[PDB]
Design a protein around this ligand. Structure first.
Ligand SMILES: Nc1nc2c(ncn2[C@@H]2O[C@H](COP(=O)(O)OP(=O)(O)OP(=O)(O)O)[C@@H](O)[C@H]2O)c(=O)[nH]1
Ligand SMILES: Nc1nc2c(ncn2[C@@H]2O[C@H](COP(=O)(O)OP(=O)(O)OP(=O)(O)O)[C@@H](O)[C@H]2O)c(=O)[nH]1
Ligand SMILES: Nc1nc2c(ncn2[C@@H]2O[C@H](COP(=O)(O)OP(=O)(O)OP(=O)(O)O)[C@@H](O)[C@H]2O)c(=O)[nH]1
Ligand SMILES: [Mg+2]
Ligand SMILES: [Mg+2]
Ligand SMILES: [Mg+2]
Lengths: 243, 243, 243
């Protein structure tokens, strides 16, 4: 029964699943999960065939389901410039998790969290494009699920400037060989796909409900707050030893 | 009178119009028309000097003139996860037409319509960047108006997953020769123009009113519901036979 | 005291500030200031490590703090197609200033202001990608503040088509040598940063308040309405004569 052609069709499907990761036919993904004090989750999907580059602005990072604005916004724009009796908005996120999956090269990831104005450092002419805390690759945890590999990074936004967050996120698809996905003979085909797809969001009342209704349904790699991995698992198939 | 310099000035204008298509000085365009049950039309202009790449998200595809939301949105996010007494929103589009015009290379077009979550296939790790139905080039109809050529593709969204649509659209400007518009000596000049222009929309109470007030006024190639071509026409001018 | 190591640490900081402009580690910026009849200012930050490309649509250019819409919008979409008793919205901007700063190559800037439909010229097939008024480089004023250089361009929107404005803005970082920032060995690293950062806006009740709470606080080069330069100043340091 193990060598039945029907089983080999199943083997084909599973070899396809693992090889599809490395193939040019798959997308890379970064999912940004935002956890609020009401226990709800806002989720952003960032995705591209070869290159993810996105800003999540303040309005993308606050809870837009359990929600004049300028009175508060002016106070997070300039020091002591507010006219609000509310010091910190309830709907600012408590914590985040970044899940990088598909064929990401984690060594190329950047997660650059700033305050409301997006300006690193003391003034715009002194801002660095890559502050040290944006070089997050080595702080991701490498998770495995069978032959699948994904990466997680989680943290707290806090009660300071980054409690009114903006975030720039970018990552490249891993290229294990030398022909660049932006080499002149390829560039125009990938440039045509620079916005496949624009950032997309959803909201869920709790993490447990999101796991059942979205994480499992879309087979998105994930780790819950209690540190349980929720991910599809494709066991490795190979006819010969691997180094 | 036919060889009067004034007539030759007119000839210059019309030769200019046809040659401007192929020139680097013109834009390419994809117009996405969305037709609603109330007979109104929402229109997106997608445009670039050399490379169009855009996502139209759900909120871009529903009727935003003849209009809590999460009760419904949750039900199109996950299976059986809704809390809405409304099964299908009235403002979801009935049908679409894609008009590709200017110097598009129709062979490079992709029109990838997904459901609300934008995720092709059974799970994110198995999604294909190019599902077969996105390779729409050969399904466009080639329309001519004098020396102008444009392409149309129309269809129905339906009452299933794509009745809650998202769409990725991309196309390149035709290059009849070998120097790429993203070749190293050109790339930075076109990259600077990657967002010339961001997607732009309008709305019109009926197709007939849109034809008079917008299609004709902007000289946009178009085909009405009764299959009438509305397009400028520049008759070909040449001093010698053409193969 | 002038050669104390503490003073040399200060010299290092100031040499760093000037050299950081030319370094790949800094961003380029275009700030778009929009001045309304109520004396308030809406401000857009456009920024990238190497290449700025942005559209500011109509809704980005009107005053969104001191604020059915289609009755008016239809009248700026098509000629005589409106159904509004209001001929011109109060919240359309009176004037603009463009500040280009950081290591911009001003020779690569374009500021292309159109009316509401974004369509240059008489029809879409005749639109030019670069109308003459978009080639604004030589109309910028070159301002200096010590070793810092920045560029300003200001003007009026008016009471015609451009009184309902849209704008495309793009500029490249100056490259004083031959290795392109989009050369094949660099392109993928900068493409990953194409949306670092998406356009970001703020609003301020008056120019004077914005100067104290934002221009000074972020050390953004600026010129007030009375023609006063507000900018950080780093005096030049060099051990030898300069041509
Ligand atoms: N968690 C919390 N902090 C509050 C509350 N009310 C006031 N605060 C204070 O506001 C402070 C904001 O400044 P920080 O000390 O930087 O707080 P933080 O970002 O959590 O701390 P760091 O880890 O040092 O960055 C917090 O430390 C709290 O002490 C509250 O209701 N909850
Ligand atoms: N057109 C229409 N369909 C309705 C209505 N109410 C319920 N439905 C049903 O809802 C169904 C949704 O599933 P499908 O069978 O996939 O409909 P569809 O997308 O138009 O059909 P396909 O062409 O096969 O994709 C439709 O087929 C209708 O039978 C209605 O008011 N109008
Ligand atoms: N400034 C101003 N103009 C008004 C007002 N009411 C009507 N208008 C007129 O509306 C006209 C709009 O057309 P234009 O002549 O092109 O005005 P403009 O854009 O300022 O002038 P140009 O510099 O020639 O482009 C203005 O010239 C005014 O004469 C008003 O309250 N204020
Ligand atoms: Mg903190
Ligand atoms: Mg259907
Ligand atoms: Mg005018």
């Amino acid at each position: 029964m193990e060598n039945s052609a029907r089983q080999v069709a199943q083997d084909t499907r599973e070899l396809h699943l693992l090889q599809h990761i490395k193939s040019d036919q798959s997308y890379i993904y970064v999912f940004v999960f935002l956890y609020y004090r009401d226990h709800s989750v806002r989720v952003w999907k960032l995705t591209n065939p070869v290159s993810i580059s996105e800003t999540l602005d303040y309005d993308d990072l606050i809870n837009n389901v359990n929600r004049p604005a300028i009175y508060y916004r002016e106070g997070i724009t300039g020091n002591d410039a507010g006219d609000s009796i509310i010091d910190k908005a309830y709907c600012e996120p408590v914590s985040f998790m970044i899940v990088a999956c598909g064929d990401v090269d984690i060594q190329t990831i950047e997660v650059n969290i700033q305050g409301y104005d997006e300006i690193e450092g003391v003034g715009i002419l002194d801002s660095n494009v890559t502050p040290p805390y944006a070089i997050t690759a080595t702080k991701f945890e490498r998770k495995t699920s069978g032959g699948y590999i994904f990466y997680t990074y989680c943290g707290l936004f806090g009660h300071g400037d980054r409690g009114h967050p903006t975030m720039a996120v970018g990552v490249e698809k891993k290229n294990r060989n030398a022909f660049g996905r932006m080499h002149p003979m390829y560039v125009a085909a990938n440039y045509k796909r620079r916005n496949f797809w624009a950032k997309k969001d959803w909201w869920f009342p709790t993490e447990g409900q999101m796991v059942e209704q979205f994480i499992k349904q879309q087979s998105i790699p994930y780790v819950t707050a209690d540190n349980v991995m929720i991910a599809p698992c494709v066991r490795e198939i190979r006819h010969h030893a691997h180094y």
